[PDB]
Ligand code: HEM
């Protein structure tokens with residue numbers, strides 16, 4: 001099964017028996033995709049154990065996988081398990097179950113439901129300022145992901161359930177942060193991916209990848225708790241009480257971890273680029289004079305704010321890779337792909353490809369200016385994926401993150417702390433994060 | 446009147462206005478010559494009156510950036526009120542305040558880079574028909590009126606990319622869409638109507654209740670019938686789909702507003718594209734060295750007459766320079782106007798509520814203090830070596846800010862796709878009966894006096 005890419009004439013690194021190419025992940029997914037993107041060209045194929053992975057970089061071929069032939073061939077992501085009752089999650093469900101859940105949870109972020117959440121979010125934007133002010137009046141370096149993670153848990157627990165709890169040692173933030181830790185040197189996540197034929201053993205043995213009593217804390221909390229929660233109970237009165245909790249675990253983890261990590265990535269670039277931070281602070285004071293409260297319309301008007309978010313998502317795509325499982329033999333864009341091959345889009349490697357980005361290692365929000373936005377291919381820069389299975393909370397996350405960036409730069413400027421990791425070392429482990437936590441000095445205006 | 450002394454109060458120079466008429470009698474040479482003479486007589490800022498309407502003309506790039514970009518949503522949101530229009534008041538180019546903001550966000554995904562890339566194969570069909578029609582008029586020595594053949598090309602591109610319908614099957618030269626759209630609006634200042642409603646603006650609420658419209662009834666009816674005929678849909682995500690999916694679902698888009706937006710896209714796709722293409726070919730015929738150098742770049746990027754693609758169009762640098770230099774000499778917008786909705790003091794200059802701030806684009810594009818030899822056609826100004834000396838607020842052929850040309854990227858792609866396939870097969874020469882030098886229409890809109898005719902030779 002390791003002579004597949006040799007048969008199809010597709011270049012790639014020579015795989016070792018059983019292991020394949022997983023020993024090249026010692027530098028992480030990001031550095032492995034960039035090295036393979038320069039050695040083999042536009043299209044290459046490696047092996048994750050016995051699973052052949054075809055990496056495509058052609059924007060037209062990316063469009064065929066993600067958009068044109070999504071409902072037909074490339075419908076499901078890589079099989080992940082053992083998951084137990086989490087198999088009913090929209091990000092894990094396949095085919096018919098994904099179609100009914102994608103359409104059910106889509107009205108969660110209609111232009112009306114998302115506008116109902118602005119008065120809910122504006123409350124926690126002041127607690128974020130009032131908590132930073134206590135660590136700003138004193139000369140204490142602030143761990144950004146701690147204060148950003150608390151704000152992210154409040155928004156997702158109120159915009160999806162309507163409960164006010166968070167905002168210190170909060171039980172939701174504590175159990176959600178340890179919900180999953182893909183440390184590739186853990187023999188568990190190493191084996192079940194390299195040697196996957198033992199997954200149905202753990203399935204019939206009632207085993208799961210998510211901790212047992214971490215799933216219990218969130219399973220009984222949803223049973224304890226029109227929004228995201230109301231949009232599903234109305235359809236319940238074949239959504240069962242078990243598939244319901246699986247979706248809440250998805251929204252709580254995504255609304256907390258994805259938001260706080262990007263915000264820390266935003267604040268790091270603004271501290272290492274004071275000209276970008278000051279130019280962004282001058283724009284917020286113009287659209288919102290006298291520290292006016294930001295509304296739904298004033299956020300979309302800020303052009304440079306969207307250019308800073310889009311550039312950071314280019315430098316730090318938290319998903320790193322996009323994956324689709326080929327469900328039947330196809331010949332797309334002049335290339336045959338057999339059934340069972342995982343078609344992967346190196347999102348991290350494409351965002352820094354010199355063929356599509358001038359000076360890619362440098363932080364320049366001017367790439368997304370209305371003059372230069374033309375030169376951006378919508379299938380090379382895909383921080384939220386693309387097609388019918390993109391980020392469902394894209395318009396939610398893009399709004400929720402910008403709502404946090406506005407209320408912070410109105411009152412505080414951020415400077416390095418010397419103990420701040422400059423340059424920022426990404427975590428060469430599993431998910432995308434910094435090695436050392438981001439710490440910055442908070443000076444009040 | 447009392448208004449007629451507004452600029453003397455503000456200390457702003459300008460021509461002395463006549464009672465009632467104001468300064469409209471100075472339009473006998475047109476908007477352009479009046480703007481150039483005022484720019485040379487009064488300087489960076491001057492004021493005049495279109496009847497009783499004070500118009501403040503600004504030429505400072507910082508003050509232009511403030512009006513078009515910085516203070517758009519808050520102050521300079523709407524253009525000069527245009528009427529009577531009937532149901533066309535719901536058009537995006539005529540809508541105001543919240544209605545324009547609704548329609549702008551609704552029609553923005555029409556021209557994304559993904560949607561524009563999908564239109565290249567559809568445009569590639571009519572590019573071959575454009576050559577076959579030119580080859581007939583080329584195989585026999587005879588002049589060729591360019592706006593007629595360019596207009597039939599522009600109508601097919603805008604009826605298929607926005608609605609998915611083919612209405613001009615290889616011509617069909619007496620196409621009803623082109624015949625009615627060309628007479629949709631002809632602002633002739635000699636016509637008392639377009640001149641009297643400016644002198645008596647109090648008659649616009651009168652003409653509206655009289656069901657009188659600046660657009661003829663038979664043209665609006667035919668365009669209103671066609672959109673209802675095209676709205677069956679039982680295609681991919683196009684301009685018509687973006688209005689139907691949101692119509693099927695504050696709310697919403699009406700049946701009359703959906704026709705109003707289509708007429709705007711039908712007119713802009715036909716008139717603006719065919720007009721600029723005619724000015725481009727006139728400059729290439731009167732400058733054979735520029736035409737040869739452009740043909741050499743097209744043959745280098747697309748050898749063996751290779752079909753143009755979305756990426757190969759953006760690669761041609763000299764083609765973009767030729768399109769930009771023609772738009773500099775012939776800015777079809779001529780003027781850029783915004784209505785000051787409330788009292789402001791931009792760049793240290795007070796502007797009262799109600800004054801129409803105007804940007805003389807034609808005068809700024811020919812200003813000697815910005816361009817060297819502005820009367821001459823020199824595409825080398827827009828080279829990447831000399832583009833550092835080009836102010837983005839002096840050269841505004843598509844406007845600037847949130848209310849710029851929504852079809853800028855589409856018009857640039859459609860014109861370049863037309864110029865590529867034409868110059869791949871033909872070269873253009875004058876024919877004596879071509880008006881040299883080209884006289885611009887001294888009337889309202891920017892057109893030539895005599896139609897552009899050229900001799901077409903096959904390669
Ligand atoms: C900066 C913030 C975020 C980024 C960059 C991001 C990125 C992504 C990406 C790349 C995908 C896969 C798209 C594909 O495979 O084509 C995805 C899927 C998903 N995201 Fe996010 N995400 C973010 C925040 C959020 C938030 C706040 C939520 C809240 C619910 C969320 C919920 C989801 C779900 C449910 C899926 C799976 C959808 C499906 O499988 O049909 N994400 N996200």
Ligand code: HEM
Pocket residue numbers: 513537538539549709710713714717718721772777778781782841842843844845846847848849850851852853855856
């Ligand atoms: C060479 C071709 C074209 C040129 C030079 C041009 C130029 C302009 C300019 C200068 C404006 C006003 C900008 C401002 O006031 O700041 C405008 C408005 C507009 N143009 Fe174009 N245009 C062209 C072609 C097109 C095409 C093909 C369309 C197709 C739909 C189009 C649709 C519009 C619309 C809808 C507006 C009004 C936008 C609004 O009011 O928000 N234009 N155009």
Ligand SMILES: CC(C)(C)OC(=O)N[C@@H](CS[C@H](Cc1ccccc1)C(=O)NCCCc1cccnc1)Cc1ccccc1
Pocket residue numbers: 080089091092179180182249250253254258319321391430431
């Ligand atoms: C192997 C790596 C580290 C690359 O990842 C995975 O361990 N497992 C992928 C699919 S299983 C995951 C299970 C899960 C995790 C946490 C909480 C609950 C369930 C999953 O469903 N997470 C999507 C939900 C949250 C999210 C995360 C990022 C962006 N938006 C939303 C993870 C993955 C990556 C990219 C797209 C979709 C899913």
Ligand SMILES: CC(C)(C)OC(=O)N[C@@H](CS[C@H](Cc1ccccc1)C(=O)NCCCc1cccnc1)Cc1ccccc1
Pocket residue numbers: 524527536538539629630632708709712713717777778779780850889890
């Ligand atoms: C009368 C003249 C031409 C001297 O001028 C004006 O007083 N009327 C300006 C704004 S009203 C116009 C009304 C209209 C015309 C024809 C059909 C339907 C309605 C309008 O909506 N046209 C924008 C739509 C199409 C277009 C035209 C040009 C560029 N792109 C798009 C005309 C104007 C000038 C410059 C930029 C934008 C508009």
